[PDB]
Amino acid sequence: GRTCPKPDDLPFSTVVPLKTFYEPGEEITYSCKPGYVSRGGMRKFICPLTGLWPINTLKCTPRVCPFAGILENGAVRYTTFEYPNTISFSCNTGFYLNGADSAKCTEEGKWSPELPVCAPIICPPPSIPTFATLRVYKPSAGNNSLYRDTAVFECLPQHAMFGNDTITCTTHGNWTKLPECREVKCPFPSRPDNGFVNYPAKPTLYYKDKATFGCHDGYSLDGPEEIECTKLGNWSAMPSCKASCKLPVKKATVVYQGERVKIQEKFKNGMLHGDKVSFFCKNKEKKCSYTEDAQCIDGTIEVPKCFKEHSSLAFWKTDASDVKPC
Numbered sequence: 585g586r587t588c589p590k591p592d593d594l595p596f597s598t599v600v601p602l603k604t605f606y607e608p609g610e611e612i613t614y615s616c617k618p619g620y621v622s623r624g625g626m627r628k629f630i631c632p633l634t635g636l637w638p639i640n641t642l643k644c645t646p647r648v649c650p651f652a653g654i655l656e657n658g659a660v661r662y663t664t665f666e667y668p669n670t671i672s673f674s675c676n677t678g679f680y681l682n683g684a685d686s687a688k689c690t691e692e693g694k695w696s697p698e699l700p701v702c703a704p705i706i707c708p709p710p711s712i713p714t715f716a717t718l719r720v721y722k723p724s725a726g727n728n729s730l731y732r733d734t735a736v737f738e739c740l741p742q743h744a745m746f747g748n749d750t751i752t753c754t755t756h757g758n759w760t761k762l763p764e765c766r767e768v769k770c771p772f773p774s775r776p777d778n779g780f781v782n783y784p785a786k787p788t789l790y791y792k793d794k795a796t797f798g799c800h801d802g803y804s805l806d807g808p809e810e811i812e813c814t815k816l817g818n819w820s821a822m823p824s825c826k827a828s829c830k831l832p833v834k835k836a837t838v839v840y841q842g843e844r845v846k847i848q849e850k851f852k853n854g855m856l857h858g859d860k861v862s863f864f865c866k867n868k869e870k871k872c873s874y875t876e877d878a879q880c881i882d883g884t885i886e887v888p889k890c891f892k893e894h895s896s897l898a899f900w901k902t903d904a905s906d907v908k909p910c
């Protein structure tokens with residue numbers, strides 16, 4: 585007699601019992617693999633006497649979990665909400681993912697784990713470090729603060745801050761490291777020789793306290809006119825009063841700050857400490873002029889040896905200042 589051959593292998597199905605051949609009368613059963621369903625309902629067949637399995641209308645397709653394209657305030661990386669695909673989630677900035685970051689479409693046709701949700705990241709109101717007060721804070725959400733919000737602290741009078749004065753509301757619901765408010769004092773500043781110094785009239789001096797200096801006519805300051813009590817208990821700087829220099833020569837064109845000037849004119853009232861200048865002097869041989877420097881260093885200034893000061897009443901030898909450059 586005849587016999588039916590092995591059954592055609594249908595997509596996403598299972599046949600039972602699956603033999604390579606059947607006797608007329610035997611029965612087999614197609615079933616969609618788990619995670620699939622059929623536009624039909626599980627087809628069974630009995631091997632005909634002809635030995636030819638009938639036409640199979642069985643079509644199995646993936647069960648489809650519920651639409652999950654939208655994630656309020658977030659992104660949903662997906663392909664097709666059908667078994668056994670995986671879909672992942674994430675939230676826009678400001679929000680955190682309250683739930684699993686991904687989920688699969690189970691063979692049952694539901695999402696596992698249950699779809700997550702994006703939620704607003706928040707920090708509770710911040711604390712005030714000792715000896716400080718924050719003047720930059722206002723709840724953005726209820727009694728609390730939202731992501732990347734800020735609060736700014738300013739220490740208390742006579743107290744120095746250590747660490748940024750500004751804190752932000754991090755993704756961890758907590759704020760960034762807080763600043764410190766220690767109290768700092770500075771010793772009184774020493775008066776400068778040939779000069780004087782001033783500062784608040786009180787028992788002790790603390791952080792951010794100002795002290796000003798100066799010098800008697802003959803001298804000038806070699807440091808800033810004003811200084812303050814730094815957070816490290818010492819001062820901005822300690823200026824001294826340095827002696828000015830009398831004009832080195834009677835008449836001469838010199839370079840002061842890259843420009844030519846009449847030295848007797850520029851420093852009519854003497855040169856201050858530090859003032860630098862450049863003298864001109866020719867190079868006999870090549871008949872051109874070059875320049876060397878000099879500077880007022882506390883009452884003294886070394887005019888270059890190469891310099892030659894021609895007298896006003898002589899003039900008859902051209903000045904180095906007027907010789908072509910070298």
Ligand SMILES: *[C@@H]1O[C@H](CO)[C@@H](O[C@H]2O[C@H](CO)[C@@H](O[C@@H]3O[C@H](CO[C@@H]4O[C@H](CO)[C@@H](O)[C@H](O)[C@@H]4O)[C@@H](O)[C@H](O[C@@H]4O[C@H](CO)[C@@H](O)[C@H](O)[C@@H]4O)[C@@H]3O)[C@H](O)[C@H]2NC(C)=O)[C@H](O)[C@H]1NC(C)=O
Nearest residue numbers: 707708747751752753754755756757758759760761762763
């Ligand atoms: C805001 O809120 C956060 C809570 O979520 C909080 O936590 C974060 O910051 C803390 C530290 O402040 C973190 O804990 C530390 O993590 C360090 C880095 O992690 C390591 O992990 C890697 C794994 O990849 C290992 O390879 C490393 O060896 C290491 O273990 C870690 O080094 C710290 O460990 C210590 O090391 C010390 C060294 O001398 C030891 O004394 C000490 O005993 C310990 O061994 C510590 O674990 C925490 O994980 C962070 N968590 C998150 C989610 O960010 C923040 O601190 C908080 N911010 C503020 C300002 O409060």
Ligand SMILES: *[C@@H]1O[C@H](CO)[C@@H](O[C@@H]2O[C@H](CO)[C@@H](O[C@@H]3O[C@H](CO)[C@@H](O)[C@H](O)[C@@H]3O)[C@H](O)[C@H]2NC(C)=O)[C@H](O)[C@H]1NC(C)=O
Nearest residue numbers: 770807808811812813814815816817818819820821822823
């Ligand atoms: C006010 O007082 C503080 C307290 O000492 C002074 O801090 C000192 O600052 C210097 C640099 O400005 C630090 O030097 C550091 O180490 C060596 C110096 O040989 C070198 O690697 C670098 O110069 C480096 O910056 C020094 O460590 C630091 N003092 C201490 C104890 O740590 C500050 O300079 C004073 N300010 C004024 C205006 O006087």
Ligand SMILES: *[C@H]1O[C@H](CO)[C@@H](O[C@H]2O[C@H](CO)[C@@H](O)[C@H](O)[C@H]2NC(C)=O)[C@H](O)[C@H]1NC(C)=O
Nearest residue numbers: 706707708709710722723724725726727728729
């Ligand atoms: C945030 O905290 C405030 C506290 O200022 C709460 O305000 C009041 O209203 C509540 C009503 O449920 C009371 O139960 C609180 O006792 C009362 N607070 C004070 C100080 O009297 C407010 O409810 C909180 N708001 C949110 C959104 O959490």
Ligand SMILES: *[C@H]1O[C@H](CO)[C@@H](O)[C@H](O)[C@H]1NC(C)=O
Nearest residue numbers: 734747748749750751752760
């Ligand atoms: C600290 O505050 C922020 C960073 O947190 C930034 O402005 C800078 O790094 C610091 N600002 C100041 C004023 O030190």
